[PDB]
Swiss-Prot record, chains A, B:
Glycans are attached at N314. The keyword ATP-binding does not apply. This is Calsequestrin-2. It comes from Homo sapiens. Calsequestrin is a high-capacity, moderate affinity, calcium-binding protein and thus acts as an internal calcium store in muscle. Calcium ions are bound by clusters of acidic residues at the protein surface, especially at the interface between subunits. Can bind around 60 Ca(2+) ions. Regulates the release of lumenal Ca(2+) via the calcium release channel RYR2; this plays an important role in triggering muscle contraction. Plays a role in excitation-contraction coupling in the heart and in regulating the rate of heart beats. It holds the Pfam family Calsequestrin. It is linked to Ventricular tachycardia, catecholaminergic polymorphic, 2: An arrhythmogenic disorder characterized by stress-induced, bidirectional ventricular tachycardia that may degenerate into cardiac arrest and cause sudden death. Patients present with recurrent syncope, seizures, or sudden death after physical activity or emotional stress. CPVT2 inheritance is autosomal recessive. One of its GO terms (biological process) is negative regulation of potassium ion transport. Changing T45A: No effect on calcium-binding and calcium-dependent dimerization. Phosphorylation in the C-terminus, probably by CK2, moderately increases calcium buffering capacity. Belongs to the calsequestrin family. Transmembrane segments: none annotated. It is found in: Sarcoplasmic reticulum lumen. GO terms for molecular function: calcium ion binding; calcium ion sequestering activity; calcium-dependent protein binding; protein homodimerization activity.
Amino acid sequence: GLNFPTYDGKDRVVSLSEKNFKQVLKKYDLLCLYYHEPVSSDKVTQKQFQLKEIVLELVAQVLEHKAIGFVMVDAKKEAKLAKKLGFDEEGSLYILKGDRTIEFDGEFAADVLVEFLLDLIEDPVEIISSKLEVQAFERIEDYIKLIGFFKSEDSEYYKAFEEAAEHFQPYIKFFATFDKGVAKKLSLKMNEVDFYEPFMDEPIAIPNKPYTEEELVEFVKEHQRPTLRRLRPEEMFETWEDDLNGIHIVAFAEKSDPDGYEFLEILKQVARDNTDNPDLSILWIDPDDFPLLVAYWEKTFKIDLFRPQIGVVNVTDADSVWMEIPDDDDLPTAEELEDWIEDVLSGKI
Amino acid sequence: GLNFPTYDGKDRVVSLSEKNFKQVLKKYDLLCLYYHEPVSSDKVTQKQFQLKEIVLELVAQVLEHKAIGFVMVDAKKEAKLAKKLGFDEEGSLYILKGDRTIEFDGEFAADVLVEFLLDLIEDPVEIISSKLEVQAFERIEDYIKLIGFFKSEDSEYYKAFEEAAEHFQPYIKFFATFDKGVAKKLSLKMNEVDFYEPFMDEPIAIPNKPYTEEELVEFVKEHQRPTLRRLRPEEMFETWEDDLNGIHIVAFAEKSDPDGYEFLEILKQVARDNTDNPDLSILWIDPDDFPLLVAYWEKTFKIDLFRPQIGVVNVTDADSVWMEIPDDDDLPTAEELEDWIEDVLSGKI
């Protein structure tokens, strides 16, 4: 007798090969495929291997929904002999069809991975319309956004918006927009495209005429940064790989808290009151969950966990410094905020 | 070579017995102990057993923090021979010291369980003080709250608040409060105790003089309900066991959405505009995570997942009905809301 929500009976999804993979690829819309070797390793390896097989076939067998061809690229074989098929190394959860195909070197767990399954099989992006969707336009205070007024469901600019969103599954936001109501409320003069800031919700319009792939992918990949960065599931290490510095400049303040709302909105008060402030963008860990990595940061970001924290980590070997003189659990913020941001305070340590 | 955050080297926390358990109990502050049998079962059982050992010793070994004596009550033995020691059956994650000892028949996963570890080792409850903690008083729009103005850190009423909060680890909220600032803002005439609604944030003062254990445990356990109920990790099945009906009256509307904010605040508009409305309290599933059980509700609550849903489940065998005629993905809410709440609309189906 198993448990809940443990797998349904037997591990049935597929570790496979070429012909199957091609028939089923051209049949399917989502293909979650990890490439792996013929694994037979040491003691400490087959444990994470077994947990990998288990989160895999648990999410799979517990799903059996219309979306995924699932599990493994068996080894080296025909991919290698074509070139490597233009792939990565001995491991990656490459997901097919998405854009054409995309990677997965994100983090491994249930809630996150099924979240990925659904919100990625979106097919395509965010259709907004009603007055309550006018509210949806002035709703998201969390992410960086990209709205656009368009002409049809089967439209040229609509298509560009779709395949550019699937090129940017990364994350951020993609509002497909219609009608004179939100047209008059938003006010961008024509059926165009408009970017938007996380908090300090600004319509940063994309400002020419018609716009295409590398142009709006230009606005997105060029200006994905702004002021504070909300860190999430895989988004911490993935914004590490998305161009860092070496100094992990973090604001560590969990939500459901005074320190969360106050830290968040005093740095974001520096954003929304000092619109510019280009001291390079500060990041935001705010531990509600992800406590394993919050334990990793409890020992490696010295000894800190449930406090109003803020500081930097010099990646490896040396140090991981934070807030010190001042501190106070009920922090001095305000102009002290203006300082200790505006260069850890202008003057160094 | 293991992975991240996979366990540190070897599974070292303890499946033990009496003398050890007593020395270490009287030494420790948190004891996370599951009682189990000498397990040697069939094929489908030892899988969830292995995943149980693995989430267990993963959170443990990856923690090694100052809090827990950890893992297993080996079998029947001295507990049984004393009586059963006044325990449950062959299984429960009984956690010692907490109140004196408390259960755990909640859900099993990392983020949730470490969240439990920290927020339960709180030791004691929520000390609020500053003007930013005046903001903390008018901050939580999510939970049901219990503030109280007190006299000292080592105070009588303070103690009652502590051990009553640990009696109610259940959940809700517990604000220990001081000083004339939030005293004048809150205005309850003396150093007393005050309850508070989730949304429609109301100071429902606890209205006599001094108050004790079974009196404020009376206000809490008697009036923990109000209007809409935010469902969470274990809180769905645990508010099933916390007195249900049979009809699982749910509002199914995920956040990051028009349907989330609109459903949430139109039923909560019925709360905040119709202060009373005692049609018995409606619940609130809003799937950001917990997608396994959202899959369980995708097949068992008929066929629904990422929509503006709302309806009931007649527990077992028969049916699980929801919103039908009207529906619309951009819902008719307003007076239609007033109906389809105020008895699935007054008139039955």
